[PDB]
Amino acid sequence: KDPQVVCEAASAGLLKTLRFVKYLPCFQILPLDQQLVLVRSCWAPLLMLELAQDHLHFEMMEIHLLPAAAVQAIKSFFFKCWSLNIDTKEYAYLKGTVLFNPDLPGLQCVKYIEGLQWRTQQILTEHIRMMQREYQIRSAELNSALFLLRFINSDVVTELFFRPIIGAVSMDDMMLEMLCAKL
């Protein structure tokens, strides 16, 4: 079946995500207000990026507990990632691309993140050339999955995976406790 188990594996995924982010030097060096911003947005895409990586195989039949194409976007994305054979290294930079997004509203450290994204693409363009050849083709392939990700929503995710567990709590409140808890 779907509900308790996937939501559990999904929730596990959220932790691993935040642990990843939290330990980044370029990240933990930021003030909390700013750390909180980044995370209060990217958490949704980033979770998706993790779950694709752990090859999450879920299917929710439906024989406020459905939207329609919304749950499709997720599968489509997963499959795209899979069909592209992404190594742990690329995943890591992909997450980086999402995380360091200077456009996010509420940032005050725009310029700082500019450079972080820059280096993010830098170390990536480098890895690509390292592994196999080209960079014109593989770049488009990656941006391909990223583009397919921007259409996920962050209301659907929380509802599909977390509402069963979290119940009646603001996901945004959760992040704060997570930027502090465990570790």
């Binding site: 030097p25 060096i29 930021l30 003030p31």
Partner: protein, 243 residues
Amino acid sequence: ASIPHLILELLKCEPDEPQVQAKIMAYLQQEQSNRNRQEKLSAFGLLCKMADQTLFSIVEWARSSIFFRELKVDDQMKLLQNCWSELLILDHIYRQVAHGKEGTIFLVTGEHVDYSTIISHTEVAFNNLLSLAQELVVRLRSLQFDQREFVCLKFLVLFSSDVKNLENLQLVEGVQEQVNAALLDYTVCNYPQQTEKFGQLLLRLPELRAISKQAEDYLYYKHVNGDVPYNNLLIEMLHAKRA
């Protein structure tokens, strides 16, 4: 023996000194106690984590500072990206003025070692470096130095007008000249016959901007041998500033 309004409140931004060593040392003791089937560190890698924490603490000290608080993050990070080394070193230096003595180095963790036992157990590249620091720790203890002129310097390094891109250039313009003066008063005030002491302190600055570069070059070298821990902060700080 009184101090100007500036330095009086600057001393208020101090980190404590008991509070930290508890934090750090418990963190490190925790880092090694940690359960990884692999990953020894070990002596070096662990010392990088120490240096990291120090820098973390140094950033708290910074953000939790009166003149630093105003002026927003984008610029906050630019000041940090310049002196992160110089400060990290200086902190150590002073710690060697306070609790440093004979052939004994005092870590920020409150532990101590034999300068001889160190120098022998370390590679030449790192000697040309530690010695280079001591050359200064002693040179300067000689010039009757302490926590008062210390924190003056910290801000002086942190707020170097010799940067580049930023908006609130006026703020640094201010404090750079507002602390130069504030220090000048204290020079002769609570001290006997130094006369040119101000010029001397202000003189040992490039002599530390210089120990810095060589220290970074060492970090990069050790980094490129893989000896530097995974998510380490110094190497991170180095890539932002370097390129």
